[PDB]
Design a protein around this motif. Sequence first.
Motif, PDB file in Angstrom:
ATOM      1  N   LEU C  10       0.774  -1.033   0.219  1.00  0.00           N
ATOM      2  CA  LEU C  10       0.055  -0.001  -0.022  1.00  0.00           C
ATOM      3  C   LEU C  10       0.969   1.633   0.267  1.00  0.00           C
ATOM      4  CD1 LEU C  10      -2.548   1.589   0.356  1.00  0.00           C
ATOM      5  CD2 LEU C  10      -2.850   1.385   2.187  1.00  0.00           C
ATOM      6  N   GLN C  11       0.976   2.259  -0.872  1.00  0.00           N
ATOM      7  CA  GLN C  11       1.716   3.124  -1.404  1.00  0.00           C
ATOM      8  C   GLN C  11       0.942   4.760  -0.173  1.00  0.00           C
ATOM      9  OE1 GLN C  11       0.351   1.664  -3.651  1.00  0.00           O
ATOM     10  NE2 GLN C  11       1.695   0.500  -4.601  1.00  0.00           N
ATOM     11  N   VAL C  12       1.881   4.929   0.059  1.00  0.00           N
ATOM     12  CA  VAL C  12       1.194   6.028   1.390  1.00  0.00           C
ATOM     13  C   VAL C  12       1.951   6.522   0.946  1.00  0.00           C
ATOM     14  CG1 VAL C  12       1.336   4.800   3.045  1.00  0.00           C
ATOM     15  CG2 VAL C  12       3.275   5.979   3.001  1.00  0.00           C
ATOM     16  N   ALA C  13       1.271   8.253   1.832  1.00  0.00           N
ATOM     17  CA  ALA C  13       1.415   9.326   1.404  1.00  0.00           C
ATOM     18  C   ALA C  13       2.109  10.238   2.589  1.00  0.00           C
ATOM     19  CB  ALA C  13       0.553  10.593   1.447  1.00  0.00           C
ATOM     20  N   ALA C  14       2.843  11.701   2.313  1.00  0.00           N
ATOM     21  CA  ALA C  14       3.518  12.345   2.823  1.00  0.00           C
ATOM     22  C   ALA C  14       3.045  12.259   4.547  1.00  0.00           C
ATOM     23  CB  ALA C  14       4.413  12.722   1.887  1.00  0.00           C
ATOM     24  N   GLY C  15       1.524  12.384   4.151  1.00  0.00           N
ATOM     25  CA  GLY C  15       1.171  13.176   5.152  1.00  0.00           C
ATOM     26  C   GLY C  15       0.424  13.091   6.628  1.00  0.00           C
ATOM     27  N   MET C  16       0.289  11.830   6.681  1.00  0.00           N
ATOM     28  CA  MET C  16      -0.020  10.971   8.247  1.00  0.00           C
ATOM     29  C   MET C  16       0.852   9.803   7.895  1.00  0.00           C
ATOM     30  SD  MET C  16      -3.407  12.556   9.625  1.00  0.00           S
ATOM     31  CE  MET C  16      -3.470  11.818  11.245  1.00  0.00           C
ATOM     32  N   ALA C  17       1.222   9.412   9.121  1.00  0.00           N
ATOM     33  CA  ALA C  17       1.597   7.674   9.238  1.00  0.00           C
ATOM     34  C   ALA C  17       0.820   6.677  10.119  1.00  0.00           C
ATOM     35  CB  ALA C  17       2.941   7.837   9.968  1.00  0.00           C
ATOM     36  N   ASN C  18      -0.137   7.243  11.270  1.00  0.00           N
ATOM     37  CA  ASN C  18      -1.225   6.586  11.722  1.00  0.00           C
ATOM     38  C   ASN C  18      -2.687   7.517  12.253  1.00  0.00           C
ATOM     39  OD1 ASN C  18      -2.284   5.492  13.306  1.00  0.00           O
ATOM     40  ND2 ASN C  18      -0.603   4.891  14.619  1.00  0.00           N
ATOM     41  N   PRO C  19      -3.291   7.465  10.826  1.00  0.00           N
ATOM     42  CA  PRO C  19      -4.654   7.219  11.254  1.00  0.00           C
ATOM     43  C   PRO C  19      -5.348   6.634  10.383  1.00  0.00           C
ATOM     44  CG  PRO C  19      -3.964   8.521   8.588  1.00  0.00           C
ATOM     45  CD  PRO C  19      -2.847   8.170   9.442  1.00  0.00           C
ATOM     46  N   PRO C  55       6.027   5.335  -2.566  1.00  0.00           N
ATOM     47  CA  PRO C  55       5.431   4.150  -2.282  1.00  0.00           C
ATOM     48  C   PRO C  55       6.406   3.542  -1.786  1.00  0.00           C
ATOM     49  CG  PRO C  55       6.245   4.810  -4.899  1.00  0.00           C
ATOM     50  CD  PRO C  55       5.571   5.618  -3.790  1.00  0.00           C
ATOM     51  N   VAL C  56       5.770   2.060  -1.144  1.00  0.00           N
ATOM     52  CA  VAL C  56       6.922   1.868  -0.163  1.00  0.00           C
ATOM     53  C   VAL C  56       6.135   0.085   0.518  1.00  0.00           C
ATOM     54  CG1 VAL C  56       5.290   2.382   1.539  1.00  0.00           C
ATOM     55  CG2 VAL C  56       8.200   2.222   2.258  1.00  0.00           C
ATOM     56  N   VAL C  57       7.749  -0.630  -0.239  1.00  0.00           N
ATOM     57  CA  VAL C  57       7.767  -1.845   0.939  1.00  0.00           C
ATOM     58  C   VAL C  57       6.986  -2.191   1.614  1.00  0.00           C
ATOM     59  CG1 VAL C  57       8.616  -4.314   0.910  1.00  0.00           C
ATOM     60  CG2 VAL C  57       9.914  -2.783  -1.033  1.00  0.00           C
ATOM     61  N   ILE C  58       5.897  -3.067   2.096  1.00  0.00           N
ATOM     62  CA  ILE C  58       5.226  -3.591   3.443  1.00  0.00           C
ATOM     63  C   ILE C  58       6.342  -4.706   3.629  1.00  0.00           C
ATOM     64  CG2 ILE C  58       3.810  -3.955   4.387  1.00  0.00           C
ATOM     65  CD1 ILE C  58       3.885  -1.118   3.463  1.00  0.00           C
ATOM     66  N   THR C  59       8.040  -4.312   4.097  1.00  0.00           N
ATOM     67  CA  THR C  59       8.448  -5.496   4.450  1.00  0.00           C
ATOM     68  C   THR C  59       7.915  -5.886   5.964  1.00  0.00           C
ATOM     69  OG1 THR C  59      10.293  -4.600   4.134  1.00  0.00           O
ATOM     70  CG2 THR C  59      10.765  -6.407   5.831  1.00  0.00           C
ATOM     71  N   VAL C  60       7.089  -7.419   5.953  1.00  0.00           N
ATOM     72  CA  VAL C  60       6.635  -8.463   7.006  1.00  0.00           C
ATOM     73  C   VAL C  60       7.010  -9.605   7.387  1.00  0.00           C
ATOM     74  CG1 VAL C  60       4.440  -8.860   7.606  1.00  0.00           C
ATOM     75  CG2 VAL C  60       4.469  -6.036   6.636  1.00  0.00           C
ATOM     76  N   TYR C  61       7.814  -9.811   8.190  1.00  0.00           N
ATOM     77  CA  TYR C  61       8.096 -11.262   8.827  1.00  0.00           C
ATOM     78  C   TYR C  61       6.258 -11.685   9.519  1.00  0.00           C
ATOM     79  CZ  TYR C  61      12.560 -10.343   6.433  1.00  0.00           C
ATOM     80  OH  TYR C  61      13.741  -9.782   5.350  1.00  0.00           O
ATOM     81  N   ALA C  62       6.996 -13.052  10.348  1.00  0.00           N
ATOM     82  CA  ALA C  62       6.509 -13.457  10.867  1.00  0.00           C
ATOM     83  C   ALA C  62       6.959 -12.973  12.383  1.00  0.00           C
ATOM     84  CB  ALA C  62       5.496 -15.252  10.572  1.00  0.00           C
ATOM     85  N   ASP C  63       8.020 -13.123  11.900  1.00  0.00           N
ATOM     86  CA  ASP C  63       8.982 -13.129  12.990  1.00  0.00           C
ATOM     87  C   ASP C  63       8.963 -11.222  13.690  1.00  0.00           C
ATOM     88  OD1 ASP C  63       9.877 -15.563  12.842  1.00  0.00           O
ATOM     89  OD2 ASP C  63      11.526 -14.433  11.502  1.00  0.00           O
ATOM     90  N   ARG C  64       7.601 -10.733  13.413  1.00  0.00           N
ATOM     91  CA  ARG C  64       7.193  -9.359  14.391  1.00  0.00           C
ATOM     92  C   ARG C  64       8.121  -8.469  14.150  1.00  0.00           C
ATOM     93  NH1 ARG C  64       4.348  -8.535  19.114  1.00  0.00           N
ATOM     94  NH2 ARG C  64       3.259 -10.179  17.688  1.00  0.00           N
ATOM     95  N   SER C  65       9.341  -9.021  13.609  1.00  0.00           N
ATOM     96  CA  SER C  65      10.043  -7.149  12.714  1.00  0.00           C
ATOM     97  C   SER C  65       9.221  -6.749  11.868  1.00  0.00           C
ATOM     98  CB  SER C  65      11.994  -8.180  12.483  1.00  0.00           C
ATOM     99  OG  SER C  65      12.445  -8.335  13.588  1.00  0.00           O
ATOM    100  N   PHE C  66       9.361  -5.534  11.548  1.00  0.00           N
ATOM    101  CA  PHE C  66       8.446  -5.216  10.043  1.00  0.00           C
ATOM    102  C   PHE C  66       8.583  -3.783  10.020  1.00  0.00           C
ATOM    103  CE2 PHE C  66       5.678  -3.601  13.024  1.00  0.00           C
ATOM    104  CZ  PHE C  66       5.449  -2.405  12.676  1.00  0.00           C
ATOM    105  N   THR C  67       9.037  -3.654   8.601  1.00  0.00           N
ATOM    106  CA  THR C  67       9.586  -1.675   7.711  1.00  0.00           C
ATOM    107  C   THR C  67       9.208  -1.446   6.705  1.00  0.00           C
ATOM    108  OG1 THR C  67      12.252  -2.792   6.705  1.00  0.00           O
ATOM    109  CG2 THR C  67      12.289  -2.487   8.986  1.00  0.00           C
ATOM    110  N   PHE C  68       9.028  -0.588   7.012  1.00  0.00           N
ATOM    111  CA  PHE C  68       8.484   0.123   5.718  1.00  0.00           C
ATOM    112  C   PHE C  68       9.948   0.515   5.100  1.00  0.00           C
ATOM    113  CE2 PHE C  68      10.434   4.053   7.861  1.00  0.00           C
ATOM    114  CZ  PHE C  68      11.515   4.568   6.993  1.00  0.00           C
ATOM    115  N   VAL C  69       9.695  -0.022   3.717  1.00  0.00           N
ATOM    116  CA  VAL C  69      11.262   0.227   2.924  1.00  0.00           C
ATOM    117  C   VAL C  69      11.140   0.882   1.590  1.00  0.00           C
ATOM    118  CG1 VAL C  69      12.671  -1.262   1.384  1.00  0.00           C
ATOM    119  CG2 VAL C  69      12.267  -1.837   3.392  1.00  0.00           C
ATOM    120  N   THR C  70      10.833   1.726   1.141  1.00  0.00           N
ATOM    121  CA  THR C  70      10.323   3.156   0.358  1.00  0.00           C
ATOM    122  C   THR C  70      11.231   3.110  -1.040  1.00  0.00           C
ATOM    123  OG1 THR C  70      10.191   5.662  -0.090  1.00  0.00           O
ATOM    124  CG2 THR C  70      12.218   4.601   0.586  1.00  0.00           C
TER     125      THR C  70
END
Lengths: 136, 26, 141, 94, 38
Positions: C10-19, C55-70
């Motif tokens: 899911l590509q995200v806008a610069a405007g907010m990170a948690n609504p 646009p950003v990679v939604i890096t998501v493991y089952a190992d609880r670690s996760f990162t945005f990777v733009t």
Amino acid sequence: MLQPKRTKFRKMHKGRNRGLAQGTDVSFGSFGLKAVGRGRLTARQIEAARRAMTRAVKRQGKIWIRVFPDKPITEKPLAVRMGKGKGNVEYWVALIQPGKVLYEMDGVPEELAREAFKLAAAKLPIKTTFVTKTVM
Amino acid sequence: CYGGDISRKKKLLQKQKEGKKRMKQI
Amino acid sequence: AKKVQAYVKLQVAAGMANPSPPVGPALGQQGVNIMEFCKAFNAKTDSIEKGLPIPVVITVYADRSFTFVTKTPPAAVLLKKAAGIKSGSGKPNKDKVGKISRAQLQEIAQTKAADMTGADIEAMTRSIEGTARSMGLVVED
Amino acid sequence: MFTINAEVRKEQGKGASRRLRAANKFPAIIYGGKEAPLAIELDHDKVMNMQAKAEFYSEVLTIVVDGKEIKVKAQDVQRHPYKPKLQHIDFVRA
Amino acid sequence: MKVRASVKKLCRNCKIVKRDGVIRVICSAEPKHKQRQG
RNA sequence: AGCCAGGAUGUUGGCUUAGAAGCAGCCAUCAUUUAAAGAAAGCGUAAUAGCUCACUGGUCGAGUCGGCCUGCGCGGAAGAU
């Protein structure tokens, strides 16, 4: 639907329908319906076929229609004893004999064309067949 | 009775309709 | 390591990170913790001027670690942005709208080099031109 | 480039002509020049195959018969009224 | 199942299977496509 | 025909949905590394996902395939002692 605007006589004889058609060649178009069969085409028939074929290629392309009715076909009312006069005009028809071209089509894909005539053919009382213009 | 004559019947249907034209609008 | 264990892109806008209408179910959630993501993405918000999709990679493991990777931003939204339309193609691609320099979308196309996956530079820049007709506009050529 | 089989007709008139057309042959006269016209009984399937190309109506083309190499152009084609079959064809010399 | 006067295919799944002296039509996908008498 | 894999990236194509993402309706089909892969095939997910297609790789070895003019056939096909 589609009858002559003026007529030389109000009524006309049953006649016969022996013979073969001249219009065996697609002309105005490039794709066509040759008749193969023999018989009558009432105006509503050619019209329903025209609608069914019109909603097919939609607005693009073009459709010439070769046949025209002019043959009055009268009938007696519901339950009158025979012969106190010939009946009043009822509905116009266009007679056809085999070899007749019916419909012609302009720049349309041939496969879409066979779709179109495949649609329009079902309305017609007679059998039909697809044809292509030939260079000569 | 039916008889098969044409004008002998349409009179009846004419009466049957002519009443309905009144009875409807009333 | 492009083999994410449980991605929901899911590509995200610069405007907010948690609504909620942008981020959330639209990016899905299962062990996801956006409540820190507000502390995550907005530095990248601060990297450049706001109001653009990122646009950003939604890096998501089952190992609880996760990162945005733009990912570097898409050319089409940028072209609607430069052309200034506030809707979309609206009218048919037969009617072009956008108007941009020819060196642009080549000095502008070069901006996407991190995500442009052709070999020849000009075939790639042309891939950006395909992204250009994607708007139903065509840059002068 | 086209080349064509042929043999001289003797039988003519509607009856013999039908006896040919039923038999997978069709009539086709050849003329042109000052000399007398000469009708030919062509085979059907062969010509029906060969003619389907458009160039057949325009290309100069031979018709073998008695080694005289008639070499002609198409002038007319009587197609059947409603079947993929042929009736009669004119072959003017060129 | 509609018997219908003219069966033909619908789904590409459809197979057109004659049985006895009579036509039938079957599709692995949708159940609705069954037919007889064509 | 089958059997083992991918079957695409920029790109959710612009849009239209408060969220079109190939798939609720348009504009359009345009440019891409590559065996090649539709900014779009059905299933499906609210929208995304996920699952099978055209292309192709090996495997298998040889006939297979769409239409044409044709004779004879079946369904269409229900009636009262």
